[PDB]
Structure 1
């Protein structure tokens, strides 16, 4: 209700995808601000990563934090809400407006009370609006609130038109409907301009069952998935990401040199800790390399926790993960790791003003001796309770 929209162009909703020879490999990174994603499951510009999990796991929060983080990264964001409640859409738009994220964002909405064709047509409209910027040299990011509600709406339309059904009554061309949409996200070559479009579809499961028809359909199209668990959400772990079932086939090519040099040890440590986490009740284990690994794993798990909004710059993430992996956190007890990292961030803003600039300008982590001296200097001031 702000008046008419004054445009002068139109784009067909059903248009073809860029060809095999019209593309280029993914190298630039997409910074989200969540440490777990940015370290273990990196996303590059032009990728298609799936976010999958049950309800009551907080996927909209992940999407909203990612959207907010793009303030000074020269990106245009599009948020598509399919089958959601109008009240939640209104509060999400109000959250976006407060953080000043409405200067580069477009919202397309088809709530649960709308006719089924609108729910089926919304994602194509979103990607059609994105392609206009994509084909002029810009970078776009499209989020689909749920790809299962669109599939259900399409199934309803097909059954009402008397088209032969299939498994779980879905039509024959239900894989086509989603693959034709998700193959329009690309990274263009230098001859076509150099623009890109990144896609983050959502799929909701029931009781954590990923064997269902649509969940297996969308897993086999995308370039990797992020798994959110309902057990970790209830306990209070935000975000409730699972690194044992999350993959990214683009890999380290979507990362900076410092993050590459830092993330491997963290991955190995978390993998080691995940096996023995369930047996902490029975101590008296091998004193050599069991409780040491338990302590390192607990320190790792505390580092990866985060709070709603307030994303973190990549240099700060790199520096804190470097501090954790080099053995600078063993003296600090588990209950003080969060406060330690917060006060470290505060410390770097005053007396660490050159390491951050070196990482920003060069994209490589600073000299080891200077880093060690800085972390040694901070520890003498931090008072441990």
Structure 2
């Protein structure tokens, strides 16, 4: 069953499973901590179960930020009301020696597995940088006298990670919805620590660096993120055909980008210009503001419902919104708000100045 996250590119193209394993793949600064704090903000309050945040080898400043922001959110309650808390934190952050970072994911699961097995309920496990589990075993493995494997990792990378990931599952007694950030080293998705993790996940959300340099946030690669929930018997045929149609015009636009760079858009067929016009529009429409990114972007964040996501991208595929400019789709919630933003863009191009005086800038009043 689907997990509605309120994120447009997630809920459309790679939708999350409610008891499944979710991986956010990232390359150092592309946005997989902002995305994982947004899922804590959107999913983990309407979930109604316990959460475990295992911080494995990430910043200690971020551990203090989440801990303090959970106290003012009432997710963590201090003092005599501690039992009304919904989250427990396990932290093995990046100042720890490599033995502590190699095992702190295991003690985060043990807290999550008790709520699944004994308490019998639904847990949310958020593991920030499960790559650091693999990297900490790789710092150790040199000194355990092992012949190193490919790029320089442990010979036991797949079974070390496999033995940990196979514990993070939904069983017949309880559920664990697991969101894990996966760092990719030197932006290399063929690196064996990202490459081994891909098989362990029901939904992989791959965040790209080139998508982030075009200002699109969340920097989700729409043609590299994948769910097993994108299946017409699971999400319905109306949802499925929009996601596959969105991916089809984004792929055919990617096939054009070699010519658009050299020859320009003047050499395109006008059948192909309608592709580039539409695929530039949905590329901006996949971005959205986050309620955790408003504190540094200024823009308030928009939770977009699944029905507003599907109908909005279906309109851009059929052609109902070819009127609007491509910057009206950028950082807006749903298709009601691109029309709200296109009206503002048109209005501004007319009214820009004539603020000389008789405002509050009088030198005596």
In which range does the TM-score fall when normalised by the shorter chain?
0.7 to 0.9
- Which residue of the partner structure matches residue 36 of structure 2? 63
Shift of 1:289: 0.5
Contact 1:120 1:150 in 2 (8 A): yes
Shift of 1:213: 2.9
Shift of 1:340: 7.5
Contact 1:49 1:225 in 2 (8 A): yes
Deviation track 1:304-329 (CA, whole Å, cap 9, x = no partner) reads 11123233222332332233233221
Contact 1:30 1:254 in 2 (8 A): no
Give the match's secondary structure for 1:264: helix
Please list every run of 5 or more consecutive structure 1 residues that lacks an aligned counterpart in the other structure.
1-27, 347-377
Give the match's secondary structure for 1:272: helix
Contact 1:76 1:105 in 2 (8 A): yes
d(CA) in 1 for partners of 2:73 and 2:235?
A: 27
Tell whether 2:316 aligns with 1:324: yes
d(CA) in 1 for partners of 2:243 and 2:220?
A: 16
Tell whether 2:129 aligns with 1:146: yes
- Which residue of the partner structure matches residue 180 of structure 2? 201
Correspondence 1:1-385 to 2 at 5 A: 28-70=1-43, 71-102=45-76, 103-135=85-117, 136-160=119-143, 162-167=144-149, 170-188=153-171, 192-193=172-173, 195-252=174-231, 255=235, 259-260=239-240, 262-280=242-260, 282-309=264-291, 310=301, 311-338=303-330, 344=336, 385=346
d(CA) in 2 for partners of 1:170 and 1:327?
A: 50
User: What is the count of residue pairs matched by the alignment?
Assistant: 321
Deviation track 1:322-360 (CA, whole Å, cap 9, x = no partner) reads 3323322111122223487568259xxxxxxxxxxxxxx
d(CA) in 1 for partners of 2:6 and 2:65?
A: 22
Contact 1:67 1:101 in 2 (8 A): no
TM-score (norm 1): 0.73
Contact 1:68 1:101 in 2 (8 A): no
Contact 1:82 1:144 in 2 (8 A): yes
Give the match's secondary structure for 2:328: helix
d(CA) in 2 for partners of 1:83 and 1:383?
A: 45
Shift of 1:256: 5.5
d(CA) in 2 for partners of 1:234 and 1:334?
A: 17
Is the alpha carbon distance of 1:34 and 1:333 closer, same or farther for their aligned partners in structure 2, counting shifts above 3 Å?
Answer: same
d(CA) in 2 for partners of 1:124 and 1:152?
A: 15
Residues 89-98 or 323-332, more deviating: 89-98
Please list every run of 5 or more consecutive structure 2 residues that lacks an aligned counterpart in the other structure.
77-84, 292-300, 347-365
Contact 2:126 2:179 in 1 (8 A): yes
TM-score (norm 2): 0.77
CA RMSD of aligned residues (A): 2.9
d(CA) in 1 for partners of 2:199 and 2:243?
A: 26
d(CA) in 2 for partners of 1:313 and 1:100?
A: 25
